[PDB]
PDB file of all heavy atoms in Angstrom:
ATOM      1  N   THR A   1      10.641 -69.422  90.114  1.00  0.00           N
ATOM      2  CA  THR A   1      11.579 -69.189  89.017  1.00  0.00           C
ATOM      3  C   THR A   1      12.692 -68.281  89.516  1.00  0.00           C
ATOM      4  O   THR A   1      12.614 -67.702  90.601  1.00  0.00           O
ATOM      5  CB  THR A   1      10.887 -68.577  87.803  1.00  0.00           C
ATOM      6  OG1 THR A   1      11.796 -68.514  86.707  1.00  0.00           O
ATOM      7  CG2 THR A   1      10.397 -67.181  88.121  1.00  0.00           C
ATOM      8  N   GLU A   2      13.737 -68.162  88.703  1.00  0.00           N
ATOM      9  CA  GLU A   2      14.901 -67.358  89.044  1.00  0.00           C
ATOM     10  C   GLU A   2      14.768 -65.964  88.445  1.00  0.00           C
ATOM     11  O   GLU A   2      14.386 -65.801  87.289  1.00  0.00           O
ATOM     12  CB  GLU A   2      16.180 -68.022  88.536  1.00  0.00           C
ATOM     13  CG  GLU A   2      17.448 -67.195  88.765  1.00  0.00           C
ATOM     14  CD  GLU A   2      18.688 -67.858  88.193  1.00  0.00           C
ATOM     15  OE1 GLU A   2      18.589 -69.017  87.746  1.00  0.00           O
ATOM     16  OE2 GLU A   2      19.754 -67.209  88.186  1.00  0.00           O
ATOM     17  N   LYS A   3      15.082 -64.954  89.259  1.00  0.00           N
ATOM     18  CA  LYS A   3      15.018 -63.558  88.832  1.00  0.00           C
ATOM     19  C   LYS A   3      16.404 -63.140  88.347  1.00  0.00           C
ATOM     20  O   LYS A   3      17.183 -62.498  89.052  1.00  0.00           O
ATOM     21  CB  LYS A   3      14.499 -62.674  89.969  1.00  0.00           C
ATOM     22  CG  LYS A   3      14.029 -61.298  89.542  1.00  0.00           C
ATOM     23  CD  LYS A   3      12.917 -60.789  90.441  1.00  0.00           C
ATOM     24  CE  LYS A   3      13.334 -60.808  91.909  1.00  0.00           C
ATOM     25  NZ  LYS A   3      12.225 -60.375  92.806  1.00  0.00           N
ATOM     26  N   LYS A   4      16.700 -63.518  87.104  1.00  0.00           N
ATOM     27  CA  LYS A   4      18.003 -63.254  86.501  1.00  0.00           C
ATOM     28  C   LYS A   4      18.023 -61.844  85.938  1.00  0.00           C
ATOM     29  O   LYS A   4      17.569 -61.597  84.823  1.00  0.00           O
ATOM     30  CB  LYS A   4      18.314 -64.280  85.427  1.00  0.00           C
ATOM     31  CG  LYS A   4      19.724 -64.169  84.851  1.00  0.00           C
ATOM     32  CD  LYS A   4      19.900 -65.072  83.643  1.00  0.00           C
ATOM     33  CE  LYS A   4      19.050 -64.600  82.472  1.00  0.00           C
ATOM     34  NZ  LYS A   4      19.405 -63.212  82.057  1.00  0.00           N
ATOM     35  N   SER A   5      18.577 -60.904  86.710  1.00  0.00           N
ATOM     36  CA  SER A   5      18.689 -59.534  86.244  1.00  0.00           C
ATOM     37  C   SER A   5      19.847 -59.404  85.259  1.00  0.00           C
ATOM     38  O   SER A   5      20.757 -60.246  85.210  1.00  0.00           O
ATOM     39  CB  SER A   5      18.894 -58.585  87.418  1.00  0.00           C
ATOM     40  OG  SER A   5      20.058 -58.918  88.151  1.00  0.00           O
ATOM     41  N   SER A   6      19.813 -58.342  84.450  1.00  0.00           N
ATOM     42  CA  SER A   6      20.867 -58.122  83.476  1.00  0.00           C
ATOM     43  C   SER A   6      22.067 -57.411  84.103  1.00  0.00           C
ATOM     44  O   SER A   6      23.212 -57.824  83.912  1.00  0.00           O
ATOM     45  CB  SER A   6      20.339 -57.305  82.296  1.00  0.00           C
ATOM     46  OG  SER A   6      20.089 -55.963  82.661  1.00  0.00           O
ATOM     47  N   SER A   7      21.803 -56.353  84.855  1.00  0.00           N
ATOM     48  CA  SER A   7      22.841 -55.584  85.528  1.00  0.00           C
ATOM     49  C   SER A   7      22.371 -55.280  86.947  1.00  0.00           C
ATOM     50  O   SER A   7      21.167 -55.099  87.176  1.00  0.00           O
ATOM     51  CB  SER A   7      23.150 -54.266  84.791  1.00  0.00           C
ATOM     52  OG  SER A   7      21.980 -53.486  84.607  1.00  0.00           O
ATOM     53  N   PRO A   8      23.287 -55.206  87.909  1.00  0.00           N
ATOM     54  CA  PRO A   8      22.889 -54.845  89.279  1.00  0.00           C
ATOM     55  C   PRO A   8      22.308 -53.440  89.374  1.00  0.00           C
ATOM     56  O   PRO A   8      21.626 -53.138  90.366  1.00  0.00           O
ATOM     57  CB  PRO A   8      24.204 -54.961  90.077  1.00  0.00           C
ATOM     58  CG  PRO A   8      25.280 -54.815  89.048  1.00  0.00           C
ATOM     59  CD  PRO A   8      24.738 -55.447  87.799  1.00  0.00           C
ATOM     60  N   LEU A   9      22.541 -52.592  88.375  1.00  0.00           N
ATOM     61  CA  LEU A   9      21.889 -51.290  88.333  1.00  0.00           C
ATOM     62  C   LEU A   9      20.389 -51.432  88.094  1.00  0.00           C
ATOM     63  O   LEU A   9      19.614 -50.566  88.501  1.00  0.00           O
ATOM     64  CB  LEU A   9      22.510 -50.422  87.248  1.00  0.00           C
ATOM     65  CG  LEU A   9      23.974 -50.059  87.465  1.00  0.00           C
ATOM     66  CD1 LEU A   9      24.516 -49.282  86.278  1.00  0.00           C
ATOM     67  CD2 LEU A   9      24.129 -49.262  88.749  1.00  0.00           C
ATOM     68  N   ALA A  10      19.964 -52.510  87.448  1.00  0.00           N
ATOM     69  CA  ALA A  10      18.555 -52.747  87.197  1.00  0.00           C
ATOM     70  C   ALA A  10      17.872 -53.273  88.460  1.00  0.00           C
ATOM     71  O   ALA A  10      18.431 -54.072  89.199  1.00  0.00           O
ATOM     72  CB  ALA A  10      18.374 -53.754  86.050  1.00  0.00           C
ATOM     73  N   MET A  11      16.649 -52.795  88.681  1.00  0.00           N
ATOM     74  CA  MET A  11      15.850 -53.213  89.830  1.00  0.00           C
ATOM     75  C   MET A  11      15.063 -54.448  89.445  1.00  0.00           C
ATOM     76  O   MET A  11      14.132 -54.371  88.626  1.00  0.00           O
ATOM     77  CB  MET A  11      14.932 -52.079  90.292  1.00  0.00           C
ATOM     78  CG  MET A  11      15.677 -50.764  90.513  1.00  0.00           C
ATOM     79  SD  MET A  11      14.597 -49.372  90.853  1.00  0.00           S
ATOM     80  CE  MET A  11      14.082 -49.721  92.534  1.00  0.00           C
ATOM     81  N   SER A  12      15.433 -55.602  90.016  1.00  0.00           N
ATOM     82  CA  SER A  12      14.851 -56.865  89.595  1.00  0.00           C
ATOM     83  C   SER A  12      13.394 -57.005  90.042  1.00  0.00           C
ATOM     84  O   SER A  12      12.630 -57.737  89.399  1.00  0.00           O
ATOM     85  CB  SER A  12      15.679 -58.034  90.125  1.00  0.00           C
ATOM     86  OG  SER A  12      15.751 -58.008  91.548  1.00  0.00           O
ATOM     87  N   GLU A  13      13.000 -56.313  91.109  1.00  0.00           N
ATOM     88  CA  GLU A  13      11.627 -56.420  91.602  1.00  0.00           C
ATOM     89  C   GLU A  13      10.636 -55.740  90.667  1.00  0.00           C
ATOM     90  O   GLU A  13       9.460 -56.110  90.659  1.00  0.00           O
ATOM     91  CB  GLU A  13      11.515 -55.828  93.007  1.00  0.00           C
ATOM     92  CG  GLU A  13      11.791 -54.331  93.103  1.00  0.00           C
ATOM     93  CD  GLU A  13      13.272 -53.991  93.063  1.00  0.00           C
ATOM     94  OE1 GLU A  13      14.091 -54.899  92.860  1.00  0.00           O
ATOM     95  OE2 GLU A  13      13.603 -52.795  93.253  1.00  0.00           O
ATOM     96  N   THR A  14      11.083 -54.766  89.873  1.00  0.00           N
ATOM     97  CA  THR A  14      10.195 -54.071  88.947  1.00  0.00           C
ATOM     98  C   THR A  14       9.685 -55.002  87.857  1.00  0.00           C
ATOM     99  O   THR A  14       8.593 -54.789  87.318  1.00  0.00           O
ATOM    100  CB  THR A  14      10.899 -52.866  88.322  1.00  0.00           C
ATOM    101  OG1 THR A  14      12.060 -53.310  87.594  1.00  0.00           O
ATOM    102  CG2 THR A  14      11.328 -51.879  89.393  1.00  0.00           C
ATOM    103  N   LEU A  15      10.438 -56.038  87.533  1.00  0.00           N
ATOM    104  CA  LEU A  15      10.051 -57.028  86.530  1.00  0.00           C
ATOM    105  C   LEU A  15       9.643 -58.303  87.243  1.00  0.00           C
ATOM    106  O   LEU A  15      10.467 -58.920  87.927  1.00  0.00           O
ATOM    107  CB  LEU A  15      11.193 -57.298  85.550  1.00  0.00           C
ATOM    108  CG  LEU A  15      10.835 -58.115  84.315  1.00  0.00           C
ATOM    109  CD1 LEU A  15       9.869 -57.336  83.414  1.00  0.00           C
ATOM    110  CD2 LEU A  15      12.091 -58.529  83.567  1.00  0.00           C
ATOM    111  N   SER A  16       8.383 -58.696  87.083  1.00  0.00           N
ATOM    112  CA  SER A  16       7.825 -59.860  87.777  1.00  0.00           C
ATOM    113  C   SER A  16       7.641 -60.994  86.781  1.00  0.00           C
ATOM    114  O   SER A  16       6.948 -60.832  85.767  1.00  0.00           O
ATOM    115  CB  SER A  16       6.496 -59.495  88.445  1.00  0.00           C
ATOM    116  OG  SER A  16       5.930 -60.628  89.079  1.00  0.00           O
ATOM    117  N   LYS A  17       8.249 -62.143  87.078  1.00  0.00           N
ATOM    118  CA  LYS A  17       8.002 -63.337  86.271  1.00  0.00           C
ATOM    119  C   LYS A  17       6.751 -64.062  86.723  1.00  0.00           C
ATOM    120  O   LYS A  17       6.116 -64.753  85.925  1.00  0.00           O
ATOM    121  CB  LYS A  17       9.212 -64.278  86.329  1.00  0.00           C
ATOM    122  CG  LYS A  17      10.423 -63.814  85.530  1.00  0.00           C
ATOM    123  CD  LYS A  17      11.536 -64.853  85.614  1.00  0.00           C
ATOM    124  CE  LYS A  17      12.659 -64.569  84.624  1.00  0.00           C
ATOM    125  NZ  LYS A  17      13.692 -65.646  84.645  1.00  0.00           N
ATOM    126  N   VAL A  18       6.387 -63.931  88.002  1.00  0.00           N
ATOM    127  CA  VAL A  18       5.135 -64.469  88.523  1.00  0.00           C
ATOM    128  C   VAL A  18       4.100 -63.338  88.539  1.00  0.00           C
ATOM    129  O   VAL A  18       4.320 -62.288  89.147  1.00  0.00           O
ATOM    130  CB  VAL A  18       5.317 -65.068  89.931  1.00  0.00           C
ATOM    131  CG1 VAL A  18       5.962 -66.445  89.836  1.00  0.00           C
ATOM    132  CG2 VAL A  18       6.175 -64.153  90.794  1.00  0.00           C
ATOM    133  N   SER A  19       2.986 -63.554  87.845  1.00  0.00           N
ATOM    134  CA  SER A  19       1.949 -62.549  87.727  1.00  0.00           C
ATOM    135  C   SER A  19       0.611 -63.133  88.145  1.00  0.00           C
ATOM    136  O   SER A  19       0.386 -64.343  88.062  1.00  0.00           O
ATOM    137  CB  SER A  19       1.860 -62.001  86.285  1.00  0.00           C
ATOM    138  OG  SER A  19       3.078 -61.393  85.902  1.00  0.00           O
ATOM    139  N   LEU A  20      -0.273 -62.250  88.611  1.00  0.00           N
ATOM    140  CA  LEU A  20      -1.611 -62.658  89.018  1.00  0.00           C
ATOM    141  C   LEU A  20      -2.559 -62.565  87.830  1.00  0.00           C
ATOM    142  O   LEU A  20      -2.652 -61.530  87.166  1.00  0.00           O
ATOM    143  CB  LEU A  20      -2.114 -61.790  90.171  1.00  0.00           C
ATOM    144  CG  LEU A  20      -3.501 -62.034  90.788  1.00  0.00           C
ATOM    145  CD1 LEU A  20      -3.512 -61.571  92.236  1.00  0.00           C
ATOM    146  CD2 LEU A  20      -4.611 -61.326  90.031  1.00  0.00           C
ATOM    147  N   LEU A  21      -3.283 -63.656  87.569  1.00  0.00           N
ATOM    148  CA  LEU A  21      -4.354 -63.650  86.587  1.00  0.00           C
ATOM    149  C   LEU A  21      -5.688 -63.319  87.247  1.00  0.00           C
ATOM    150  O   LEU A  21      -6.342 -62.339  86.908  1.00  0.00           O
ATOM    151  CB  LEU A  21      -4.425 -64.992  85.856  1.00  0.00           C
ATOM    152  CG  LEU A  21      -3.155 -65.411  85.112  1.00  0.00           C
ATOM    153  CD1 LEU A  21      -3.384 -66.726  84.378  1.00  0.00           C
ATOM    154  CD2 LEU A  21      -2.712 -64.316  84.140  1.00  0.00           C
ATOM    155  N   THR A  22      -6.094 -64.137  88.209  1.00  0.00           N
ATOM    156  CA  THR A  22      -7.274 -63.902  89.025  1.00  0.00           C
ATOM    157  C   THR A  22      -6.861 -64.024  90.484  1.00  0.00           C
ATOM    158  O   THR A  22      -5.793 -64.567  90.782  1.00  0.00           O
ATOM    159  CB  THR A  22      -8.402 -64.909  88.713  1.00  0.00           C
ATOM    160  OG1 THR A  22      -8.119 -66.157  89.368  1.00  0.00           O
ATOM    161  CG2 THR A  22      -8.517 -65.144  87.214  1.00  0.00           C
ATOM    162  N   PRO A  23      -7.682 -63.519  91.413  1.00  0.00           N
ATOM    163  CA  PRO A  23      -7.336 -63.661  92.841  1.00  0.00           C
ATOM    164  C   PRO A  23      -7.104 -65.097  93.287  1.00  0.00           C
ATOM    165  O   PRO A  23      -6.640 -65.292  94.416  1.00  0.00           O
ATOM    166  CB  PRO A  23      -8.539 -63.037  93.556  1.00  0.00           C
ATOM    167  CG  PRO A  23      -9.048 -62.026  92.590  1.00  0.00           C
ATOM    168  CD  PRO A  23      -8.831 -62.615  91.223  1.00  0.00           C
ATOM    169  N   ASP A  24      -7.403 -66.101  92.453  1.00  0.00           N
ATOM    170  CA  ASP A  24      -7.148 -67.495  92.799  1.00  0.00           C
ATOM    171  C   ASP A  24      -6.287 -68.193  91.763  1.00  0.00           C
ATOM    172  O   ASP A  24      -6.083 -69.421  91.864  1.00  0.00           O
ATOM    173  CB  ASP A  24      -8.472 -68.253  92.961  1.00  0.00           C
ATOM    174  CG  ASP A  24      -9.338 -67.690  94.077  1.00  0.00           C
ATOM    175  OD1 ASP A  24      -8.798 -67.038  94.985  1.00  0.00           O
ATOM    176  OD2 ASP A  24     -10.573 -67.903  94.034  1.00  0.00           O
ATOM    177  N   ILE A  25      -5.773 -67.484  90.768  1.00  0.00           N
ATOM    178  CA  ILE A  25      -5.012 -68.089  89.663  1.00  0.00           C
ATOM    179  C   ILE A  25      -3.808 -67.209  89.351  1.00  0.00           C
ATOM    180  O   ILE A  25      -3.982 -66.036  88.989  1.00  0.00           O
ATOM    181  CB  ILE A  25      -5.868 -68.281  88.404  1.00  0.00           C
ATOM    182  CG1 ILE A  25      -6.968 -69.318  88.627  1.00  0.00           C
ATOM    183  CG2 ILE A  25      -4.999 -68.678  87.224  1.00  0.00           C
ATOM    184  CD1 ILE A  25      -7.908 -69.462  87.460  1.00  0.00           C
ATOM    185  N   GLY A  26      -2.611 -67.776  89.460  1.00  0.00           N
ATOM    186  CA  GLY A  26      -1.387 -67.112  89.074  1.00  0.00           C
ATOM    187  C   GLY A  26      -0.647 -67.910  88.010  1.00  0.00           C
ATOM    188  O   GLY A  26      -0.981 -69.064  87.712  1.00  0.00           O
ATOM    189  N   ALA A  27       0.385 -67.285  87.449  1.00  0.00           N
ATOM    190  CA  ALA A  27       1.094 -67.882  86.328  1.00  0.00           C
ATOM    191  C   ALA A  27       2.569 -67.497  86.374  1.00  0.00           C
ATOM    192  O   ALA A  27       2.934 -66.422  86.871  1.00  0.00           O
ATOM    193  CB  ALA A  27       0.481 -67.485  84.988  1.00  0.00           C
ATOM    194  N   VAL A  28       3.412 -68.386  85.845  1.00  0.00           N
ATOM    195  CA  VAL A  28       4.834 -68.158  85.641  1.00  0.00           C
ATOM    196  C   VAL A  28       5.192 -68.724  84.283  1.00  0.00           C
ATOM    197  O   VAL A  28       4.392 -69.411  83.645  1.00  0.00           O
ATOM    198  CB  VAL A  28       5.690 -68.772  86.765  1.00  0.00           C
ATOM    199  CG1 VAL A  28       5.821 -70.283  86.566  1.00  0.00           C
ATOM    200  CG2 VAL A  28       7.055 -68.114  86.856  1.00  0.00           C
ATOM    201  N   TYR A  29       6.405 -68.433  83.803  1.00  0.00           N
ATOM    202  CA  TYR A  29       6.747 -68.787  82.440  1.00  0.00           C
ATOM    203  C   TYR A  29       8.220 -69.146  82.310  1.00  0.00           C
ATOM    204  O   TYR A  29       9.014 -69.020  83.249  1.00  0.00           O
ATOM    205  CB  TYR A  29       6.434 -67.642  81.479  1.00  0.00           C
ATOM    206  CG  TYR A  29       7.510 -66.568  81.472  1.00  0.00           C
ATOM    207  CD1 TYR A  29       8.314 -66.365  80.370  1.00  0.00           C
ATOM    208  CD2 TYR A  29       7.696 -65.765  82.596  1.00  0.00           C
ATOM    209  CE1 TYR A  29       9.296 -65.380  80.379  1.00  0.00           C
ATOM    210  CE2 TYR A  29       8.668 -64.786  82.608  1.00  0.00           C
ATOM    211  CZ  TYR A  29       9.470 -64.592  81.497  1.00  0.00           C
ATOM    212  OH  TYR A  29      10.435 -63.611  81.503  1.00  0.00           O
ATOM    213  N   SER A  30       8.567 -69.598  81.107  1.00  0.00           N
ATOM    214  CA  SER A  30       9.944 -69.770  80.676  1.00  0.00           C
ATOM    215  C   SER A  30       9.998 -69.467  79.185  1.00  0.00           C
ATOM    216  O   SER A  30       9.213 -70.006  78.404  1.00  0.00           O
ATOM    217  CB  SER A  30      10.459 -71.184  80.962  1.00  0.00           C
ATOM    218  OG  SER A  30      10.530 -71.424  82.354  1.00  0.00           O
ATOM    219  N   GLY A  31      10.932 -68.590  78.798  1.00  0.00           N
ATOM    220  CA  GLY A  31      11.054 -68.201  77.404  1.00  0.00           C
ATOM    221  C   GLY A  31      11.254 -66.710  77.202  1.00  0.00           C
ATOM    222  O   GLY A  31      12.103 -66.097  77.849  1.00  0.00           O
ATOM    223  N   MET A  32      10.447 -66.120  76.316  1.00  0.00           N
ATOM    224  CA  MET A  32      10.601 -64.716  75.946  1.00  0.00           C
ATOM    225  C   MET A  32       9.710 -63.843  76.824  1.00  0.00           C
ATOM    226  O   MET A  32       8.477 -63.940  76.749  1.00  0.00           O
ATOM    227  CB  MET A  32      10.260 -64.509  74.469  1.00  0.00           C
ATOM    228  CG  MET A  32      11.009 -65.451  73.523  1.00  0.00           C
ATOM    229  SD  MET A  32      10.635 -65.132  71.793  1.00  0.00           S
ATOM    230  CE  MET A  32      11.138 -63.423  71.650  1.00  0.00           C
ATOM    231  N   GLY A  33      10.320 -62.971  77.627  1.00  0.00           N
ATOM    232  CA  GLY A  33       9.605 -62.097  78.524  1.00  0.00           C
ATOM    233  C   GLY A  33       8.449 -61.323  77.918  1.00  0.00           C
ATOM    234  O   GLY A  33       7.335 -61.326  78.463  1.00  0.00           O
ATOM    235  N   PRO A  34       8.671 -60.616  76.805  1.00  0.00           N
ATOM    236  CA  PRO A  34       7.601 -59.793  76.236  1.00  0.00           C
ATOM    237  C   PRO A  34       6.374 -60.598  75.814  1.00  0.00           C
ATOM    238  O   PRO A  34       5.234 -60.141  76.008  1.00  0.00           O
ATOM    239  CB  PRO A  34       8.277 -59.122  75.044  1.00  0.00           C
ATOM    240  CG  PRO A  34       9.720 -59.125  75.367  1.00  0.00           C
ATOM    241  CD  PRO A  34       9.968 -60.387  76.115  1.00  0.00           C
ATOM    242  N   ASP A  35       6.578 -61.771  75.211  1.00  0.00           N
ATOM    243  CA  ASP A  35       5.453 -62.624  74.874  1.00  0.00           C
ATOM    244  C   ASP A  35       4.666 -62.999  76.113  1.00  0.00           C
ATOM    245  O   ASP A  35       3.436 -62.981  76.102  1.00  0.00           O
ATOM    246  CB  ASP A  35       5.944 -63.884  74.146  1.00  0.00           C
ATOM    247  CG  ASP A  35       6.618 -63.578  72.821  1.00  0.00           C
ATOM    248  OD1 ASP A  35       7.025 -62.414  72.619  1.00  0.00           O
ATOM    249  OD2 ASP A  35       6.734 -64.495  71.985  1.00  0.00           O
ATOM    250  N   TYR A  36       5.362 -63.316  77.207  1.00  0.00           N
ATOM    251  CA  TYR A  36       4.678 -63.654  78.449  1.00  0.00           C
ATOM    252  C   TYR A  36       3.891 -62.463  78.993  1.00  0.00           C
ATOM    253  O   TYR A  36       2.781 -62.629  79.507  1.00  0.00           O
ATOM    254  CB  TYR A  36       5.685 -64.126  79.493  1.00  0.00           C
ATOM    255  CG  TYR A  36       5.138 -64.188  80.897  1.00  0.00           C
ATOM    256  CD1 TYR A  36       4.242 -65.180  81.273  1.00  0.00           C
ATOM    257  CD2 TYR A  36       5.533 -63.255  81.849  1.00  0.00           C
ATOM    258  CE1 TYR A  36       3.753 -65.251  82.568  1.00  0.00           C
ATOM    259  CE2 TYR A  36       5.036 -63.312  83.145  1.00  0.00           C
ATOM    260  CZ  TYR A  36       4.146 -64.305  83.493  1.00  0.00           C
ATOM    261  OH  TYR A  36       3.647 -64.361  84.775  1.00  0.00           O
ATOM    262  N   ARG A  37       4.441 -61.257  78.886  1.00  0.00           N
ATOM    263  CA  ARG A  37       3.746 -60.087  79.406  1.00  0.00           C
ATOM    264  C   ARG A  37       2.457 -59.817  78.632  1.00  0.00           C
ATOM    265  O   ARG A  37       1.389 -59.625  79.227  1.00  0.00           O
ATOM    266  CB  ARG A  37       4.673 -58.869  79.371  1.00  0.00           C
ATOM    267  CG  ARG A  37       4.187 -57.695  80.207  1.00  0.00           C
ATOM    268  CD  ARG A  37       5.151 -56.526  80.145  1.00  0.00           C
ATOM    269  NE  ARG A  37       5.278 -56.007  78.780  1.00  0.00           N
ATOM    270  CZ  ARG A  37       6.334 -56.196  78.008  1.00  0.00           C
ATOM    271  NH1 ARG A  37       7.393 -56.878  78.420  1.00  0.00           N
ATOM    272  NH2 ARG A  37       6.337 -55.689  76.777  1.00  0.00           N
ATOM    273  N   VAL A  38       2.553 -59.814  77.300  1.00  0.00           N
ATOM    274  CA  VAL A  38       1.340 -59.588  76.509  1.00  0.00           C
ATOM    275  C   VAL A  38       0.349 -60.727  76.690  1.00  0.00           C
ATOM    276  O   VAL A  38      -0.866 -60.523  76.666  1.00  0.00           O
ATOM    277  CB  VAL A  38       1.692 -59.359  75.032  1.00  0.00           C
ATOM    278  CG1 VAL A  38       2.595 -58.150  74.870  1.00  0.00           C
ATOM    279  CG2 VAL A  38       2.323 -60.600  74.407  1.00  0.00           C
ATOM    280  N   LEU A  39       0.852 -61.948  76.935  1.00  0.00           N
ATOM    281  CA  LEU A  39      -0.056 -63.066  77.174  1.00  0.00           C
ATOM    282  C   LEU A  39      -0.781 -62.920  78.508  1.00  0.00           C
ATOM    283  O   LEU A  39      -1.960 -63.254  78.601  1.00  0.00           O
ATOM    284  CB  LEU A  39       0.710 -64.386  77.118  1.00  0.00           C
ATOM    285  CG  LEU A  39       0.759 -65.059  75.745  1.00  0.00           C
ATOM    286  CD1 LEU A  39       1.461 -66.404  75.830  1.00  0.00           C
ATOM    287  CD2 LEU A  39      -0.646 -65.238  75.194  1.00  0.00           C
ATOM    288  N   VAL A  40      -0.088 -62.416  79.532  1.00  0.00           N
ATOM    289  CA  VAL A  40      -0.745 -62.199  80.819  1.00  0.00           C
ATOM    290  C   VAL A  40      -1.801 -61.116  80.707  1.00  0.00           C
ATOM    291  O   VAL A  40      -2.891 -61.222  81.282  1.00  0.00           O
ATOM    292  CB  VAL A  40       0.298 -61.858  81.903  1.00  0.00           C
ATOM    293  CG1 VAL A  40      -0.398 -61.398  83.179  1.00  0.00           C
ATOM    294  CG2 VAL A  40       1.154 -63.067  82.195  1.00  0.00           C
ATOM    295  N   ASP A  41      -1.508 -60.050  79.950  1.00  0.00           N
ATOM    296  CA  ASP A  41      -2.512 -59.024  79.712  1.00  0.00           C
ATOM    297  C   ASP A  41      -3.743 -59.594  79.015  1.00  0.00           C
ATOM    298  O   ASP A  41      -4.881 -59.399  79.472  1.00  0.00           O
ATOM    299  CB  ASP A  41      -1.899 -57.876  78.893  1.00  0.00           C
ATOM    300  CG  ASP A  41      -0.856 -57.093  79.666  1.00  0.00           C
ATOM    301  OD1 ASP A  41      -0.720 -57.320  80.891  1.00  0.00           O
ATOM    302  OD2 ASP A  41      -0.152 -56.266  79.049  1.00  0.00           O
ATOM    303  N   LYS A  42      -3.526 -60.314  77.910  1.00  0.00           N
ATOM    304  CA  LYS A  42      -4.637 -60.925  77.191  1.00  0.00           C
ATOM    305  C   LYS A  42      -5.406 -61.897  78.078  1.00  0.00           C
ATOM    306  O   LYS A  42      -6.635 -61.985  77.990  1.00  0.00           O
ATOM    307  CB  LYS A  42      -4.111 -61.643  75.945  1.00  0.00           C
ATOM    308  CG  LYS A  42      -3.702 -60.716  74.809  1.00  0.00           C
ATOM    309  CD  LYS A  42      -3.261 -61.515  73.590  1.00  0.00           C
ATOM    310  CE  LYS A  42      -2.997 -60.618  72.389  1.00  0.00           C
ATOM    311  NZ  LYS A  42      -4.205 -59.846  71.996  1.00  0.00           N
ATOM    312  N   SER A  43      -4.700 -62.637  78.935  1.00  0.00           N
ATOM    313  CA  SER A  43      -5.346 -63.622  79.798  1.00  0.00           C
ATOM    314  C   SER A  43      -6.233 -62.951  80.833  1.00  0.00           C
ATOM    315  O   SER A  43      -7.356 -63.413  81.096  1.00  0.00           O
ATOM    316  CB  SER A  43      -4.297 -64.499  80.463  1.00  0.00           C
ATOM    317  OG  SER A  43      -3.503 -65.160  79.502  1.00  0.00           O
ATOM    318  N   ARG A  44      -5.740 -61.883  81.471  1.00  0.00           N
ATOM    319  CA  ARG A  44      -6.583 -61.131  82.386  1.00  0.00           C
ATOM    320  C   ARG A  44      -7.825 -60.601  81.691  1.00  0.00           C
ATOM    321  O   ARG A  44      -8.950 -60.719  82.203  1.00  0.00           O
ATOM    322  CB  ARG A  44      -5.782 -59.986  83.019  1.00  0.00           C
ATOM    323  CG  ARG A  44      -4.584 -60.432  83.839  1.00  0.00           C
ATOM    324  CD  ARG A  44      -3.653 -59.268  84.094  1.00  0.00           C
ATOM    325  NE  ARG A  44      -2.565 -59.618  85.004  1.00  0.00           N
ATOM    326  CZ  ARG A  44      -1.563 -58.801  85.316  1.00  0.00           C
ATOM    327  NH1 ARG A  44      -1.468 -57.592  84.819  1.00  0.00           N
ATOM    328  NH2 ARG A  44      -0.623 -59.236  86.163  1.00  0.00           N
TER     329      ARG A  44
END
């Protein structure tokens, strides 16, 4: 996926669109960032 930062002052690496669920399962998304973050937490 594309790491579309808002401003160059923002550190794009601090926000990860690709997250680890299990050591053999990862996930990426499209849509609303916060929903994806809480979903990754719930999924772990």
Side-chain angles (χ1 to χ4, degrees):
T1 187
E2 176 183 352
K3 196 149 55 182
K4 186 189 67 60
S5 59
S6 72
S7 56
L9 296 176
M11 308 173 74
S12 59
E13 65 282 6
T14 60
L15 191 66
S16 179
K17 287 182 169 184
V18 282
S19 299
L20 181 153
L21 301 183
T22 79
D24 299 337
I25 293 175
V28 77
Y29 80 112
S30 294
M32 308 183 58
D35 297 19
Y36 166 73
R37 195 179 62 254
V38 300
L39 269 184
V40 170
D41 292 350
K42 286 183 174 300
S43 302
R44 298 164 174 175

